[PDB]
Swiss-Prot record, chain B:
The gene is NOS1. Homodimer. Interacts with DLG4; the interaction possibly being prevented by the association between NOS1 and CAPON. Forms a ternary complex with CAPON and RASD1. Forms a ternary complex with CAPON and SYN1. Interacts with ZDHHC23. Interacts with NOSIP; which may impair its synaptic location. Interacts with HTR4. Interacts with SLC6A4. Interacts with VAC14. Interacts (via N-terminal domain) with DLG4 (via N-terminal tandem pair of PDZ domains). Interacts with SLC6A4. The lineage of its organism: Eukaryota, Metazoa, Chordata, Craniata, Vertebrata. It comes from the Eukaryota. This is Nitric oxide synthase 1. Ubiquitinated; mediated by STUB1/CHIP in the presence of Hsp70 and Hsp40 (in vitro). It comes from Homo sapiens. Heme b binds at residues 111, 402.
Length: 408, 413
């Protein structure tokens, strides 16, 4: 059945037909919704998945049922038959990667989806090769602050024993250190990964903003440490346009958000190492990297310097302090000419993108729980936008952390 | 379905186990392939449909009073069954009415105030016959719940539906709301959310003061008759003028709001019985007024004027001038209510209380249905503990439900 979605602010109604093309499950049933749950091959399984993906590719280049399509179908059938897998053409790889982003229901940045620079690293064989590919990625995507979306795609899974993995959750992150006195220096979200790197030979500078090394696994082997050359790591000292004491907080962040722990699924092939990067939405740094209790947790410090009344929560001191931190982050990246988007502009673009997708595609899977920004939700247009969430493929999926599976 | 479902809190690592989802009754709107969790809304029951709905409820009530399988349990079952057999319906005992109303609140997945569910004052209005009578009951409800500012949660339950042609309805969506008037030039005076209902009231004979904060009259339908207008005595309408602890100019905005949030358009379902008029009231969370009522674009939309008086740069959105004004408006609302000693709760305290409530329900009841999309407040989402809390949503009965607007279905006499 066709499904309508209403924006209750504009009264705009869109009609979704695209959800009819999904097959993977969402985790909900008719009786229980799991919309706020973060996480709810063989030749036999492989050809239908390959067929569907090939079908939608040639349908996208408007040569469905062509001779080129027909021959690709048999080429792929014969290759699965004789090798238990197949290899994507370069055109298919690029199309698959763009559409995995296009289909990422949790991403508010998808208006850019077709401007993805795809780096084919399927010829990689060693961790040194991975490090070279990743440095080029970082260098290209950073582009001296004029950030450019990019993905680097390492070889697909074969038997599960020869996976390529970036053990880092993101290419650039700061270290976190469990202090003797109990607390945490650095980033508390990375305390475990930081200890894995120390356990592997990394000499930690035990600072507050120590860039972690890359820990890279090629073809199932033990992972190897690499230091990203610092000139490739663009950082922004966070200052504030009005509070001149803000720079004295000593804060900074990296310019390049680059997810490296996800799995890219295209035509039944699994790319366990596909680091992808874009540019930040300000709240990603300033609401949650700095103000989550289990993160940098600086709200108290900022509210202190703002001389706010912190005895009762109903003074909203946390909310004031939160806004000022996000002002500072936006102002800092913008003053350094480093690409960043505020959550008002990003959600604006997403509503526009949604309208584009409904028009040209028949829908747009979107995860309201993730799309609505972590602050000032209802003064953004997505808060009032009904969204339908469903799973389209190609897709980015979560996978287990490598240190839970790897036989050393 | 699987026997146990786990939800995680991603800030605290705490994991909870839900078994209550197995008692889920009606549907969520989601399927295996599509989730409708952000969709706002995803002729009576026959004898054969009613018997099992009644038994399910009666079993649950007697299990709650630790008398399950008792003689009075079996007797009540038999008396209900005879009643449905001969009259096609049945009447709840007062104990069961009270239990069912309290549990419809306890079960309301979209409500962050549920830690209070067991303290609901239930007013039995099932002897009402006329709209004047409904007006009396509702006035008594407002006065009791307002309590000179020390608000008390309450519900007034009018007669259940019979054949559908004799419904009791409060046509108002909430007992206390401000009028909205569309001007010929396209601007709106008052509350833009309430223009449609205001126009109905004017057609029904209301003389509008045509001001910014005019309380709407009650529009009340008894036993299926045409609805009738009543002015609530203004002394029963507690109001709070909005001022700011630092910005002396904030009171010059002439803003005020009423103290009592009182929903009057929902249907209460208990044991298959349908109470189409069941106004219920609590106290406000500050953001309901300071974010949605004042700062929604299609509402009072005062962000621009507040930012102007704060002298913020309103040309770039990256100045976050909207967010900065939103916080001060919410500071003023919380500070005005506390100064006048009217009960209100900020979103930090309400969400902490809800997490505590949810953990106890998981422990004592086996689960707590919650709609994250509605539970997380409309500002400062992730600095509240509910943001990081996974929640399972499902529909238990007794429950509060939406129902069509009465002007869409009423057969005019
Ligand atoms: C171009 C600028 C981009 C912006 C502003 C942006 C914005 C965002 C934000 C704010 C989130 C939620 C982040 C979180 O809270 O964890 C997100 C999620 C996501 N983005 Fe985008 N993104 C961008 C680029 C990309 C690219 C280039 C890809 C892939 C090629 C991508 C794929 C995803 C995926 C898969 C998620 C979901 C991750 C998860 O499930 O944890 N995004 N995006
Ligand atoms: C006592 C203090 C209470 C507080 C602080 C409170 C808080 C809230 C809030 C903030 C919402 C979301 C409102 C919105 O955004 O429209 C809500 C929804 C709801 N509340 Fe509570 N509430 C309270 C009392 C009650 C009572 C007494 C009942 C019923 C007996 C109730 C039943 C509901 C229901 C059914 C909803 C869903 C409304 C809808 O879907 O439109 N609440 N509540
Ligand atoms: C390509 C991309 C761009 C972007 N802009 N975002 C993401 C989402 C993943 C991500 C990467 C980061 F490098 C930082 C964050 C911040 C998330 C918030 C919530 C918890 C910690 N901060 C998210 C991906
Ligand atoms: C019993 C109760 C208490 C409370 N505290 N809340 C509600 C929710 C229903 C409601 C009634 C109102 F009178 C005002 C609001 C504000 C909610 C948002 C949506 C529309 C504008 N504000 C909500 C009910
Ligand atoms: C589209 C979306 O479902 C809609 O805007 C919802 C979002 N969450 C909400 N949450 C609450 N508490 N109240 C609301 O009215 C809404 N509106
Ligand atoms: C419990 C809940 O699913 C979890 O906290 C989600 C909520 N919404 C989110 N939204 C974004 N953008 N990012 C997140 O990490 C989360 N976390
Ligand atoms: Zn769902």
């Amino acid at each position: 059945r066709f499904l309508k979605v209403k924006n209750w602010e504009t009264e705009v109604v869109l009609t979704d037909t695209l959800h009819l093309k999904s097959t993977l499950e969402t985790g909900c049933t008719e009786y229980i919704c799991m919309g706020s749950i973060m996480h709810p091959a063989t030749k036999d399984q492989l050809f239908p998945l390959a067929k569907e993906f090939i079908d939608q590719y040639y349908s996208s280049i408007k040569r469905f049922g062509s001779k080129a399509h027909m021959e690709r179908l048999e080429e792929v059938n014969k290759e699965i038959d004789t090798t238990s897998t197949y290899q994507l053409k370069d055109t298919e790889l690029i199309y698959g990667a763009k559409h995995a982003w296009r289909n990422a229901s949790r991403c508010v940045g998808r208006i850019q989806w077709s401007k993805l620079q795809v780096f084919d690293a399927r010829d990689c064989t060693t961790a040194h090769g991975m490090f070279n590919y990743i440095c080029n990625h970082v260098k290209y995507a950073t582009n001296k602050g004029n950030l450019r979306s990019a993905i680097t795609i390492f070889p697909q899974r074969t038997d599960g024993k020869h996976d390529f993995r970036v053990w880092n959750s993101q290419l650039i992150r700061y270290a976190g250190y469990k202090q003797p006195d109990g607390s945490t220096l650095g980033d508390p979200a990375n305390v475990q990964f930081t200890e894995i790197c120390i356990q592997q030979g990394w000499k930690p500078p035990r600072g507050r903003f120590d860039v972690l090394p890359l820990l890279l696994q090629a073809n199932g082997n033990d992972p190897e440490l690499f230091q990203i050359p610092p000139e490739l790591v663009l950082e922004v000292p966070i200052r504030h346009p009005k509070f001149e004491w803000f720079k004295d907080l000593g804060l900074k962040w990296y310019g390049l958000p680059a997810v490296s722990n996800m799995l890219l699924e295209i035509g039944g092939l699994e790319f366990s190492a596909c680091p992808f990067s874009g540019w930040y939405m300000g709240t990603e740094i300033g609401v949650r990297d700095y103000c989550d209790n289990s993160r940098y947790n600086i709200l108290e410090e900022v509210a202190k310097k703002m001389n706010l009344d912190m005895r009762k929560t109903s003074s909203l001191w946390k909310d004031q302090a939160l806004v000022e931190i996000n002002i500072a982050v936006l102002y800092s990246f913008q003053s350094d000419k480093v690409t960043i988007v505020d959550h008002h502009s990003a959600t604006e673009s997403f509503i526009k993108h949604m309208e584009n997708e409904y028009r040209c595609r028949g829908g747009c899977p979107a995860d309201w729980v993730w799309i609505v920004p972590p602050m000032s939700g209802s003064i953004t247009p997505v808060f009032h936008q009904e969204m339908l969430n469903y799973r389209l493929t190609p897709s980015f999926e979560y996978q287990p952390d490598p240190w839970n599976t790897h036989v050393w």
